[PDB]
Every structure is written in structure tokens, then in C-alpha cells.
Design an enzyme around this catalytic site. Structure first.
Site, PDB file in Angstrom:
ATOM      1  N   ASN A  35      -2.104   7.990   3.023  1.00 31.40           N
ATOM      2  CA  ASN A  35      -3.414   7.395   3.297  1.00 31.40           C
ATOM      3  C   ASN A  35      -3.660   6.321   2.245  1.00 31.40           C
ATOM      4  O   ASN A  35      -3.779   6.624   1.051  1.00 31.40           O
ATOM      5  CB  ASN A  35      -4.543   8.424   3.320  1.00 31.40           C
ATOM      6  CG  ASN A  35      -5.843   7.857   3.942  1.00 31.40           C
ATOM      7  OD1 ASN A  35      -6.249   6.728   3.654  1.00 31.40           O
ATOM      8  ND2 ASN A  35      -6.487   8.641   4.796  1.00 31.40           N
ATOM      9  N   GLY A  37       0.090  -6.307  10.603  1.00 33.02           N
ATOM     10  CA  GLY A  37      -0.047  -5.356   9.523  1.00 33.02           C
ATOM     11  C   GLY A  37       1.223  -4.595   9.205  1.00 33.02           C
ATOM     12  O   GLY A  37       1.327  -4.013   8.118  1.00 33.02           O
ATOM     13  N   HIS A  66       6.748 -14.693   5.135  1.00 31.01           N
ATOM     14  CA  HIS A  66       5.399 -15.025   5.562  1.00 31.01           C
ATOM     15  C   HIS A  66       4.367 -14.049   5.033  1.00 31.01           C
ATOM     16  O   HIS A  66       3.178 -14.253   5.277  1.00 31.01           O
ATOM     17  CB  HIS A  66       5.338 -15.118   7.099  1.00 31.01           C
ATOM     18  CG  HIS A  66       5.241 -13.805   7.815  1.00 31.01           C
ATOM     19  ND1 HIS A  66       6.305 -13.245   8.491  1.00 31.01           N
ATOM     20  CD2 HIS A  66       4.183 -12.988   8.037  1.00 31.01           C
ATOM     21  CE1 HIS A  66       5.919 -12.112   9.052  1.00 31.01           C
ATOM     22  NE2 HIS A  66       4.634 -11.934   8.792  1.00 31.01           N
ATOM     23  N   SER A 124       4.082  -6.257   9.198  1.00 31.34           N
ATOM     24  CA  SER A 124       4.972  -7.291   8.678  1.00 31.34           C
ATOM     25  C   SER A 124       5.384  -6.982   7.242  1.00 31.34           C
ATOM     26  O   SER A 124       4.620  -6.398   6.459  1.00 31.34           O
ATOM     27  CB  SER A 124       4.298  -8.666   8.736  1.00 31.34           C
ATOM     28  OG  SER A 124       4.153  -9.144  10.060  1.00 31.34           O
ATOM     29  N   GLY A 125       6.611  -7.391   6.900  1.00 34.59           N
ATOM     30  CA  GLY A 125       7.249  -7.017   5.654  1.00 34.59           C
ATOM     31  C   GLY A 125       7.962  -5.678   5.668  1.00 34.59           C
ATOM     32  O   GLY A 125       8.818  -5.436   4.797  1.00 34.59           O
ATOM     33  N   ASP A 133      12.863 -15.149   7.338  1.00 31.97           N
ATOM     34  CA  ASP A 133      11.605 -14.529   6.915  1.00 31.97           C
ATOM     35  C   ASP A 133      11.887 -13.292   6.052  1.00 31.97           C
ATOM     36  O   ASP A 133      11.689 -12.138   6.451  1.00 31.97           O
ATOM     37  CB  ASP A 133      10.752 -14.188   8.125  1.00 31.97           C
ATOM     38  CG  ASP A 133       9.357 -13.765   7.738  1.00 31.97           C
ATOM     39  OD1 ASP A 133       9.019 -13.857   6.533  1.00 31.97           O
ATOM     40  OD2 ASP A 133       8.588 -13.349   8.631  1.00 31.97           O
ATOM     41  N   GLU A 136       1.066   8.371  -5.607  1.00 36.52           N
ATOM     42  CA  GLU A 136       1.101   6.910  -5.637  1.00 36.52           C
ATOM     43  C   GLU A 136       1.654   6.369  -6.959  1.00 36.52           C
ATOM     44  O   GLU A 136       1.437   6.933  -8.037  1.00 36.52           O
ATOM     45  CB  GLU A 136      -0.302   6.337  -5.418  1.00 36.52           C
ATOM     46  CG  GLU A 136      -0.915   6.614  -4.043  1.00 36.52           C
ATOM     47  CD  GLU A 136      -1.634   7.967  -3.958  1.00 36.52           C
ATOM     48  OE1 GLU A 136      -1.601   8.744  -4.943  1.00 36.52           O
ATOM     49  OE2 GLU A 136      -2.231   8.241  -2.898  1.00 36.52           O
TER      50      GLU A 136
HETATM   51  O1  LIG Z   1      -1.230   5.612 -12.518  1.00 37.41           O
HETATM   52  C1  LIG Z   1      -1.707   5.148 -11.220  1.00 37.41           C
HETATM   53  C2  LIG Z   1      -2.864   5.955 -10.769  1.00 37.41           C
HETATM   54  O2  LIG Z   1      -3.866   5.963 -11.790  1.00 37.41           O
HETATM   55  C3  LIG Z   1      -3.470   5.388  -9.499  1.00 37.41           C
HETATM   56  O3  LIG Z   1      -4.403   6.281  -9.021  1.00 37.41           O
HETATM   57  O4  LIG Z   1      -2.456   5.125  -8.427  1.00 37.41           O
HETATM   58  C4  LIG Z   1      -1.162   4.587  -8.914  1.00 37.41           C
HETATM   59  C5  LIG Z   1      -0.654   5.254 -10.175  1.00 37.41           C
HETATM   60  O5  LIG Z   1       0.562   4.622 -10.576  1.00 37.41           O
HETATM   61 CA   LIG Z   2      -2.877   6.866  -1.095  1.00 37.61          CA
END
Ligand SMILES: O[C@@H]1[C@@H](O)[C@H](O)OC[C@H]1O
Ligand SMILES: [Ca+2]
Ligand SMILES: O[C@@H]1[C@@H](O)[C@@H](O)OC[C@H]1O
Length: 223
Positions: A54, A175, A40, A177-178, A84, A62
Site C-alpha cells: 500500500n 501509472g 518517459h 509505466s517504468g 524508452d 519500506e
Molecule cells: O527509514 C524509512 C522510514 O522511516 C519510512 O517510513 O519509509 C522508508 C524507510 O526507509
Molecule cells: Ca507502504
């Protein structure tokens, strides 16, 4: 997550964020190029955001990867939420380190009583609305099929289990979910549904991953 705590940055390394211009679901990294989620949660235009604490701030760890393909379970019923579960393939392989890690799929189902880690960026309040920017964590035991079936008559299939607390105050929520439910280092559940959040005699209902290891593994070896 209602009634939980701040996990800490990158301390749940398999937790992903599903982003389509904004966080809308969680997901669970299971190998460098596949995320498992809730069916879903399916939508077009999904980017997978790994290494997030964050979600409104770039922090250093990230990885943002576009989905290349999504596979909603062949038998997903959106009316009963039976089956699901969904698989997302990443366009490029994530680079794995200590903060971005995959979580092991079960060889066994977790038993009623077993205590698990539920984490997500979902609403933190039960009567009211408030969404966190950092990831929230909850430890909740698994509940028995007989109190699960009581709490939600006619709705609990062999493809679901309840986890949480029947006195209420502590749950996953809109929020989340998954997202993962991890027990003894095993992705046992997927945040799926419930009646409200953190409500008395209404525990979270979770997709039962151990029923789908065969479907997950053979999907991933052919896609
Ligand atoms: O290269 C990417 C970066 O530029 C971004 O800020 O967040 C994800 C990273 O994979
Ligand atoms: Ca972040
Ligand atoms: O949870 C229920 C679901 O299983 C289905 O029957 O649709 C109505 C919902 O209340």
C-alpha cells in the site's frame, strides 16, 4: 493493471515505486543501488520507494531512497518512444532481503508465446479511472512481431515488443509505466506505451530490455 489481480504484499520484491510527492511511475530494482525504468518517466526530484504494497500506508518493509543520478538512454526519442529506458542510481544502497530483491537481467530475449508477470500501481479500469493503493499483477503472454506490427502500424521498432491479449480487457495502464515485465525470472520488458488500456486489438507495448544489457552493464560499471 487492468484485468489483473492483487499480487500480495511484497511478493514482487523487485518492484519499486517512483515517488515525487506521489506515486507517478514504476521501476525495477536490478542491484542494491540501481533501478531501471522508462525514459518517459524521467523527472527531477525522484525518491525510490522499495518494499511497497500500500503506497498510501507505512506497513513495515519500506525503504525510501533519493535518486543520486538519472540516466535517460542516450538515444531516447520521446516522440516515437523508441528506446524508452532509463537508469536511476540510489543515493544509498538498498538493504537486500526476501521482500526487497533485485531481478536478473536477461542473457536472451524472451520468445513470442512466453508468459510474463506485469505489475504496477496503474489505473485498473479501461473506460474510467481508478487507482489502487496495493500492487496489481497481470500474467500476459508475449505477442508476435507480426501481430504487434499490425496492431500499431509504423510504430513498432526492434526496441519494442507487444504483450497482452488482442481481445482486450487485460493490460497495463497509465501509472504502470517504468514497471517490470518479468518472464522466467528475467526482466524482459519495461511498461512503455499503448493506445488506451485493455482495448481490443491494442496490446501493451514494452521496451525490449535484452537490447540494453550491454548499455546497462557498462553504465553501471562506470557510474
Ligand atoms: O527509514 C524509512 C522510514 O522511516 C519510512 O517510513 O519509509 C522508508 C524507510 O526507509
Ligand atoms: Ca507502504
Ligand atoms: O504511436 C505513434 C508514435 O509512434 C508516433 O508516430 O507518434 C504518433 C503515435 O500515434
Amino acid at each position: 493493471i487492468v484485468g489483473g489481480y492483487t499480487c500480495g504484499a511484497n511478493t514482487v520484491p523487485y518492484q519499486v515505486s517512483l515517488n515525487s510527492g506521489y506515486h507517478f511511475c514504476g521501476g525495477s530494482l536490478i542491484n542494491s543501488q540501481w533501478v531501471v525504468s522508462a525514459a518517459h518517466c524521467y523527472k527531477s526530484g525522484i525518491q525510490v520507494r522499495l518494499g511497497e504494497d500500500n503506497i498510501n500506508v507505512v506497513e513495515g518493509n519500506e525503504q525510501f531512497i533519493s535518486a543520486s543520478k538519472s540516466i535517460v538512454h542516450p538515444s531516447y526519442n520521446s516522440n516515437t518512444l523508441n528506446n524508452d529506458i532509463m537508469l536511476i542510481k540510489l543515493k544509498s544502497a538498498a538493504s537486500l532481503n526476501s521482500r526487497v530483491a533485485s531481478i536478473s537481467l536477461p542473457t536472451s530475449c524472451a520468445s513470442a508465446g512466453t508468459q510474463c508477470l506485469i505489475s504496477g500501481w496503474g489505473n485498473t479500469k479501461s473506460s474510467g479511472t481508478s487507482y489502487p493503493d496495493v500492487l496489481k499483477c497481470l500474467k500476459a503472454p508475449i505477442l508476435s512481431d507480426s501481430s504487434c506490427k499490425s496492431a500499431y502500424p509504423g510504430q513498432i521498432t526492434s526496441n519494442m515488443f507487444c504483450a497482452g491479449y488482442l481481445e482486450g480487457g487485460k493490460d497495463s495502464c497509465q501509472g504502470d509505466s517504468g514497471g517490470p515485465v518479468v518472464c522466467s525470472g528475467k526482466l524482459q520488458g519495461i511498461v512503455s506505451w499503448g493506445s488506451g488500456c485493455a482495448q481490443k486489438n491494442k496490446p501493451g507495448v514494452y521496451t525490449k530490455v535484452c537490447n540494453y544489457v550491454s548499455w546497462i552493464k557498462q553504465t553501471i560499471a562506470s557510474n
